[PDB]
């Protein structure tokens, strides 16, 4: 669920508030359209498409589904007690948190005008 994804980000990018990732580029947060503006936006586009795929599983709601995971000693793991929806969303989230840790963050790309720039 979004609270757990927020905690995965806190566990992989400790030197930055998770809100930094909430409204970035064309895909991070609200946005879901146009040309991703940079590497971090590309992380967010793959994450958004990942959710869209998970949503094809009956009864699977990625923003709300609680899954089982651990974040300890620099390692993030999705655990084996997850059902098919929980495992998929857990993987979408984990994949995105690891992506965010490797991508450069460009202040200029925070809170861009999605209506003008993400067509």
């Amino acid at each position: 669920n979004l609270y757990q994804f927020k905690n995965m980000i806190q566990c992989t990018v400790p030197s930055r508030s998770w809100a930094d990732f909430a409204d970035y580029g064309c895909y991070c947060g609200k946005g879901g359209s146009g040309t991703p503006v940079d590497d971090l936006d590309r992380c967010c586009q793959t994450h958004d498409n990942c959710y869209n795929e998970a949503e094809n599983i009956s009864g699977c709601r990625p923003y709300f589904k609680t899954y089982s995971y651990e974040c300890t000693q620099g390692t993030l793991t999705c655990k084996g007690d997850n059902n098919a929806c929980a495992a998929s969303v857990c993987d979408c989230d984990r994949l995105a948190a690891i992506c965010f840790a490797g991508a450069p963050y460009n202040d200029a790309n925070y809170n861009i005008d999605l209506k003008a720039r993400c067509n």
Binding site: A22, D23, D48
Partner: peptide, 8 residues
């Protein structure tokens, strides 16, 4: 959470 927000 309750509220929001990202990504999709």
């Amino acid at each position: 959470k309750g509220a929001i927000i990202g990504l999709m």
